[PDB]
Amino acid sequence: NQSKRARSDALLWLAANFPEAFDNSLRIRPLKIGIMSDILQHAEKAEQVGVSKSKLREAVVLFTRRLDYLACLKAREVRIDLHGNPVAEVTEEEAENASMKIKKRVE
């Protein structure tokens, strides 16, 4: 319960500070491989408002396990950094891994 609200807080902090990556009100886009390391460079600012590094990791894990995120991992879609800049493209293997994950969760 407390850990859940702490995870939700981390997700709200991610959407407020990096909405290009984590504001999913209209769209969701593939994230850079290693986006977690980029987020953790901001850990000091997050901790001042009550968000720990481990809650930042839990929030990214929750965000990227959602089916709508897995569904956006299609071959040659663009991966973005925290500010929505294009950095790479989704590979066929990554797209296959994502669809396999979706099929497992609905079963």
Numbering used by the authors: 19 to 125
Question: Which sentences from the paper describe this structure?
Answer:
The ProQ/FinO family of RNA binding proteins mediate sRNA-directed gene regulation throughout gram-negative bacteria. The RocC/RocR system regulates competence, a specialized physiological state involving the coordinated expression of multiple genes which allows the bacteria to uptake environmental DNA and integrate it into its chromosome (i.e., natural transformation).
Deletion of the N-terminal 13 residues, which are disordered in our structures, did not impact RNA-binding affinity or transformation repression. Furthermore, we tested the binding affinity of a RocC construct containing an additional C-terminal predicted helical region (RocC1-137). This construct had the same binding affinity as 1–126, indicating that this additional region does not play a significant role in RNA binding.
